């Protein structure tokens, strides 16, 4: 079974409808989300939970605005908690070039996300 992240932004995210979406296609296969980083809280410095176990990594925020999403400093944290089997389920056309630098690899298999090693 396996331990994981959801990261969510509380726009679209503080009804239970992504919530309960995003923790029914882990329950039903075999995650679990544990560890719930806001992006106001996390940014702030309220929460800090492991540095470990968490290497399958789910970021809901809404997708319909055309403006820009999250800092640089915060993928380095993030990335910063994982091991080489670390998965992430999240980032789009920018942060291609953003997982390149940091030390991700991109794979585009259509649940669409960045492994890093």
């Given at each position: 079974?396996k331990t994981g992240?959801?990261?969510?932004?509380?726009?679209?995210?503080?009804?239970?409808?992504?919530?309960?979406?995003?923790?029914?296609?882990?329950?039903?296969?075999?995650?679990?989300?544990?560890?719930?980083?806001?992006?106001?809280?996390?940014?702030?410095?309220?929460?800090?939970?492991?540095?470990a176990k968490y290497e399958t990594v789910?970021?809901?925020?809404?997708?319909?605005?055309?403006?820009?999403?999250?800092?640089?400093?915060?993928?380095?944290?993030?990335?910063?908690?994982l091991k080489p089997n670390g998965s992430?389920?999240?980032?789009?056309?920018?942060?291609?070039?953003?997982?390149?630098?940091?030390?991700?690899?991109?794979?585009?298999?259509?649940?669409?996300?960045?492994?890093?090693?």
């Open positions: 079974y992240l959801l990261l969510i932004h509380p726009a679209v995210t503080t009804t239970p409808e992504l919530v309960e979406n995003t923790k029914a296609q882990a329950a039903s296969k075999k995650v679990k989300f544990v560890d719930q980083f806001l992006i106001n809280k996390l940014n702030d410095g309220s929460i800090t939970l492991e540095n789910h970021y809901l925020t809404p997708e319909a605005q055309t403006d820009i999403k999250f800092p640089k400093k915060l993928i380095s944290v993030l990335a910063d908690s992430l389920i999240g980032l789009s056309d920018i942060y291609k070039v953003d997982a390149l630098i940091n030390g991700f690899e991109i794979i585009n298999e259509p649940d669409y996300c960045w492994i890093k090693m």
